[PDB]
């Protein structure tokens, strides 16, 4: 709870909704909130019945097939006018985040049963499987593999009826940064520097003057 704990949490749900647009997932369950109230305490354990279930999804192949983009400018929505690394990193993590997982589409199959997302201790098992490819997460464009890793299990939410795991999979992904994963991030200037580094498409306009 410093100053980037809740600011770096909104940008995680931004690219998440852009990737669930091609899949066909309804984000109305996250806005209403009915799985984190009186549905299941700490998490549901009636979802995991067999390991031969969470490893296949009929909506895990929609990215490069339905009109693929070769990065022409995703930061054309203009969201860096709000200032602060929260709403400004919305399009910054879209031209390098949504586009990143749009090229190779989805190479994840048995990834749902690899980390296992069902109980409340699914966070510790998630940090072990993602750490295998997080050995080179020192660059601003290499840390994107961490966000796209926890954004591929959002399709198995409506398939296994576990809408409680999709509302917390993007929550612990943002808290992990504020925990101890912010060495070179806080050294430069949070995630605000990432907006003027990768997504400089909206920064090349030099704004206009909506303040004065």
Curated annotation (Swiss-Prot):
Consequence recorded when altering residue 159 to A: No effect on caspase-1 cleavage
Tissue: Bcl-X(S) is expressed at high levels in cells that undergo a high rate of turnover, such as developing lymphocytes. In contrast, Bcl-X(L) is found in tissues containing long-lived postmitotic cells, such as adult brain.
Motif extent (BH3): 89-103
Site (Cleavage): 64-65
Record motif BH2, residues: 183-198
GO biological process, one term: positive regulation of apoptotic process
GO MF term list: BH3 domain binding; channel activity; identical protein binding; protein kinase binding
Residue numbers of Phosphoserine PTMs: 52, 65
Motif BH4 per record, residues: 7-27
SUPFAM superfamilies, per the entry: Bcl-2 inhibitors of programmed cell death
Residues in coiled coil: none
Role summary: Potent inhibitor of cell death. Inhibits activation of caspases. Appears to regulate cell death by blocking the voltage-dependent anion channel (VDAC) by binding to it and preventing the release of the caspase activator, CYC1, from the mitochondrial membrane. Also acts as a regulator of G2 checkpoint and progression to cytokinesis during mitosis. Isoform Bcl-X(L) also regulates presynaptic plasticity, including neurotransmitter release and recovery, number of axonal mitochondria as well as size and number of synaptic vesicle clusters. During synaptic stimulation, increases ATP availability from mitochondria through regulation of mitochondrial membrane ATP synthase F(1)F(0) activity and regulates endocytic vesicle retrieval in hippocampal neurons through association with DMN1L and stimulation of its GTPase activity in synaptic vesicles.
Alphabetized PANTHER family for the sequence: BCL-2 RELATED (PTHR11256), BCL-2-LIKE PROTEIN 1 (PTHR11256:SF12)
Domain notes: The BH4 motif is required for anti-apoptotic activity. The BH1 and BH2 motifs are required for both heterodimerization with other Bcl-2 family members and for repression of cell death.
Protein name, entry field: Bcl-2-like protein 1
Origin species: Homo sapiens (Human)
């Amino acid at each position: 709870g410093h100053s980037m704990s809740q600011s770096n949490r909104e940008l995680v749900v931004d690219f998440l909704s852009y990737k669930l647009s091609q899949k066909g997932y309804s984000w109305s369950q996250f806005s209403d909130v009915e799985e984190n109230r009186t549905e299941a305490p700490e998490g549901t354990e009636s979802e995991m019945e067999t390991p031969s279930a969470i490893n296949g999804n009929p909506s895990w192949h929609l990215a490069d097939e339905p009109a693929v983009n070769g990065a022409t400018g995703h930061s054309s929505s203009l969201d860096a006018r709000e200032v602060i690394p929260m709403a400004a990193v919305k399009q910054a993590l879209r031209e390098a985040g949504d586009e990143f997982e749009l090229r190779y589409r989805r190479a994840f199959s048995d990834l749902t049963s690899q980390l296992h997302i069902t109980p409340g201790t699914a966070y510790q098992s998630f940090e072990q499987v993602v750490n295998e490819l997080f050995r080179d997460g020192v660059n601003w464009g290499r840390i994107v593999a961490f966000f796209s890793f926890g954004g591929a299990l959002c399709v198995e939410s409506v398939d296994k009826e576990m809408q409680v795991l999709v509302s917390r999979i993007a929550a612990w992904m943002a808290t992990y940064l504020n925990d101890h994963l912010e060495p070179w991030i806080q050294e430069n200037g949070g995630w605000d520097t990432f907006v003027e580094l990768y997504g400089n498409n909206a920064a090349a306009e030099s704004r206009k003057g909506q303040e004065r």
